[PDB]
Structure 1
Amino acid sequence: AAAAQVFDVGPRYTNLSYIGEGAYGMVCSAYDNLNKVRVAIKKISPFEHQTYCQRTLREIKILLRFRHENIIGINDIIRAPTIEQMKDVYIVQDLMETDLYKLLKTQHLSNDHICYFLYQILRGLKYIHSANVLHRDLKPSNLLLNTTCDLKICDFGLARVADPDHDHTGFLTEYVAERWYRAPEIMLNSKGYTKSIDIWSVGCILAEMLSNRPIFPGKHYLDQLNHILGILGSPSQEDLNCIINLKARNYLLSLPHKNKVPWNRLFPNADSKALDLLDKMLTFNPHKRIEVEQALAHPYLEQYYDPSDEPIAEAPFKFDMELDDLPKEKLKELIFEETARFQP
């Protein structure tokens, strides 16, 4: 077994090079001795933990169903031929040279790159939302790029089927997705079961592409709201009237008045069309927040916008995957069945 621990991707995939740690394993580039191209392989070792099996199954089911230029595909899956022998799963993907997080740490983006990246993020997100799926973890590290600036959305581990009828919850309800890209309603009254939570995350990414730093870098759950409201200012009476939960409403009413900080103050060299779209994506009230199809049609993106070339999903997910309380053993059996089509 080739080692890097065991990275047992058989004879086909050779010349392994450690390109990071992952969720439930490590990631390597490798030479595909068949297709004579380098590839990424993610070793996943999740069968110990019911949570790890849930995220692994959800991610495999979604990425096998999706087919889109701006969403990472699965080219291959390597696992043992029997459930008993299966400890690790290896997911083979196109090799991408970098990610937007690594890029923002090191590179000034031109207005043309910001425009093109945002276009490709929304084009992929249109397809995801069209499939009745919410990503729920959009952040720079989950946007891969290659040397010609092609962008692919990855990491569907926290993705869910949209369920707006069941989105409402209490104040300060605990959440999983990265704090800095969390929509204000998450801290207030939302489980994050609506498409508007992804649009908030995209708006945070846009702001981060304009400055190379996170726009709302909260140090904890409730500091996150301090940050958002320091820029958007105090929510309007109308926007408060949409929050019926007394704990969330009275919290907001307890805060001192703050006027909006205008985007042109924060980003004085930004394209004014970019700031108009940013404003529409970072709307406090999720009911007023721009939707993915309206974002694509915004004047900022007019050099790229072509809805005939922005495909939607053939086969939407109609109901959620009832993985909530399956024994890890049933989830290992579902992962086994979902990966069967790659077996010789």
Structure 2
Amino acid sequence: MVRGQVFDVGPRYTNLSYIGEGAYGMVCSAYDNVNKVRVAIKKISPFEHQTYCQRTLREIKILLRFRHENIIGINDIIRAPTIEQMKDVYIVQDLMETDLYKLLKTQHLSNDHICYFLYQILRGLKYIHSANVLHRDLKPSNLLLNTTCDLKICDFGLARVADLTEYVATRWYRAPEIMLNSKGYTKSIDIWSVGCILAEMLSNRPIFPGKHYLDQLNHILGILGSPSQEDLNCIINLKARNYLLSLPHKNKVPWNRLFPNADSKALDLLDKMLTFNPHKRIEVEQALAHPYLEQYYDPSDEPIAEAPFKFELDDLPKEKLKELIFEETARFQPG
């Protein structure tokens, strides 16, 4: 019933309107008749593939456990009464106005707006990391905003407990560790992504675009300068590490040269987030306490996860995952 595709969510949810489609599934807005408000609904069809089943169950488990102002919640979940009839899952969430991707594509943000958006991203990230979770895919299109500039992080399908390469729409926010296929990356990958997002808010253009990870790395080296051997002490492809060390030397571009109109405090924080070496990268608590954010900083108002996360699903056959998804969504069935 939308774009020639079945969106079977009535009778509670009616007046459907298309929002978007992508790897995450298809998202519409709908009128919730029980709550008398419009909501967002994501349709997902994961049961054929083992990795989609993983991500679906992971997203559901995480978001049902999380509760934070700057993290999207799950309001309801629609699926068939029988596991045999279940082919699709519809996840109902708060309807926001837009995402940061669309906002940045056409709108200018004042420094005060950039400051408040970044605070909310980091405040949410603090909660996620406190739950021992890596998001792993932060980017402008999964930062949702409403009219009053409130921000929520969504899209936790790629998330993981903190102890690829499928298709993705964009790789521009991925830390160097990730796209050098390093094994043993940590929370600091999310800080890199946030740094990339901050840069994009400052200029309305991606800081490290590129057609493949090699082109992206050239962009990164073109700004940060050549990496030392210590920057590359991870377990990574030796030929890839050797290629990087072999490139013509690049000097660091001063941040104020790239961003001549930015707040100097913003750029000082930006610098600490976009450090090549992940060990030297600022952590989220320190970032929140940076002078750039001091007008918003409040440790008594930056909650952490009550029950930090402990699940493994990697090893499970999809039919066992399907079962677990069926069980996890049972509480939302009438009744």
Task: Report the TM-score range of the alignment, normalised by the length of the smaller protein.
Answer: over 0.9
**Aligned 1:86-125 pairs, distance under 5 A:** 86-125=86-125
Q: What is the aligned-residue identity percentage?
A: 99
Q: Is the deviation greater in 177-186 or in 115-124?
A: 177-186
Contact kept in structure 2, 1:79 and 1:88, CA below 8 Å: yes
Q: For 2:137 and 2:211, how far apart are their aligned partners in 1?
A: 18
User: Contact between 2:63 and 2:74, CA under 8 Å: does it hold in 1?
Assistant: yes
d(CA) in 2 for partners of 1:279 and 1:200? 10
| Residue 136 of structure 1: how far off its partner (Å) | 0.3
Conserved? CA contact 1:132–1:316, under 8 Å: yes
Contact 1:71 1:124 in 2 (8 A): yes
CA deviation after TM superposition for structure 1 residue 335, in Å? 0.6
Query: Taking structure 1 as reference, are residues 159 and 129 closer, same or farther at Cα in structure 2, changes over 3 Å only?
Result: same
Looking at structure 2, the residues matched to 246 and 288 of structure 1 have their Cα atoms a distance apart, in angstroms, of 22
Per the alignment, residue 330 of structure 1 pairs with 320
CA offset at residue 48 of structure 1?
1.7
TM-score (normalizing by structure 1) = 0.91
SS at match of 2:118: helix
CA distance in 2, matches of 1:314, 1:206: 29
Q: 1:173 to 1:257 in 2, by over 3 A?
A: farther
SS in structure 2 at match of 1:31:
strand
CA shift in 2, pair 1:242/1:10, >3 Å:
closer
* 1:247-295 deviation digits (Å, cap 9, x = unpaired): 3442232111111001100100000000000000001110110000000
Greater CA deviation, 256-265 or 174-183? 174-183
Contact 1:137 1:178 (C-alpha < 8 Å) held by counterparts: no
Question: What is the distance in 2 between the residues matched to 1:202 and 1:49?
Answer: 30
The CA distance in 2 between the partners of 1:128 and 1:248, in whole Å, is: 32
Tell me: CA distance 1:20–1:301, structure 2 relative to 1, closer, same or farther (3 Å): same
2:213 is paired with a residue whose SS is: coil
Shift in CA distance, 243/258, structure 1 to aligned 2, threshold 3 Å: farther
CA contact (8 A) 1:24 1:46 kept: no
The change in CA–CA distance for 1:174 and 1:20 in structure 2 (over 3 A counts) is closer
- Residue 60 of structure 1 deviates from its aligned partner by 0.5
The structural deviation recorded for 1:238 is 4.4
- Contact 1:22–1:42 under 8 Å retained in 2: no
> Does the 8 Å contact 1:136/1:192 carry over to 2?
no
Q: Could you say if the C-alpha distance between residues 175 and 33 of structure 1 is closer, same or farther in structure 2, counting changes exceeding 3 Å?
A: closer
CA shift, 1:243, in A, is: 6.9
Evaluate the alpha carbon distance shift between residue 295 and residue 175 of structure 1 in structure 2; reply closer, same or farther with a 3 A threshold.
farther
Question: 1:121 offset after TM fit, Å?
Answer: 0.4
Cα distance in 2 between the residues matched to 1:87 and 1:71: 27
Distance (Å, rounded) in 2 between the aligned partners of 1:17 and 1:242:
47
Q: 1:137 touches 1:177 (CA, 8 Å); kept in 2?
A: no
Distance 1:13 1:137, change over 3 A: same
Figure out how many residues of one structure are paired with residues of the other and give that number.
330
**Contact 1:132-1:317 at 8 Å conserved across structures:** yes
Change in 2 beyond 3 A, CA 1:192/1:64: farther
Gaps of 5+ in 2: none
Equivalent residues of 2:42, 2:92 under 8 A apart:
yes
Task: Give the superposed CA RMSD.
Answer: 2.0
Determine if the alignment matches structure 1 residue 139 to structure 2 residue 135. Answer: no
Q: Distance in 2 between matches of 1:9 and 1:242?
A: 48
> Are the aligned partners of 1:186 and 1:192 in contact in 2 as well (CA < 8 Å)?
no
Residue 340 and residue 212 in structure 1: after superposition, are their counterparts in 2 closer, same or farther (change >3 A)? same
Query: Which has the larger displacement, 191-200 or 112-121?
Result: 191-200
Q: CA deviation at 1:188?
A: 3.5
For the Cα contact (< 8 Å) 1:40–1:95, is it kept in 2? yes
Deviations 1:161-180 (A, max 9, x none): 11xxxxxxxxx999968421
